[PDB]
């Protein structure tokens, strides 16, 4: 009913989808991470994170909106599917955890970098209409 939240973002650029080395995730248990399959997009968020209500959504929370999303294991599967200058609902279902779209495995290239956000397995994505972009500027 209310189990799932979701965010607008412009997907301005998508990075090659190859094996990459993933960062020494700080505070975990130290090992050598094998090369992963991977690809990421540089993406700019519209509104803010809006809640599951019924079928559709709530109104976006109160809104720097650069985000990189991060693809890896079976999150590969979102790859072809995600065409630059196109703009998606990023959906995640379950119980609304308050700071979900906000930060969280990583790159190595994106080492430090401010606002990386990990795509999860049951995630999914939604292209959007000009209806649906335009509804969430107008709220
Ligand atoms: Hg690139
Ligand atoms: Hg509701
Ligand atoms: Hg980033």
Redesign the pocket.
Known sequence: ??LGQSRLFLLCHKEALMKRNFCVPPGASPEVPKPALSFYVLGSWLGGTQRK??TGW?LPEPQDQKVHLIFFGSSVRWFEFLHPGQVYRLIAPGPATPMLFEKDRRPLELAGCASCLTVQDNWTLELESSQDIQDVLDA
């Open positions: 009913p209310h209500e019924g709530g």
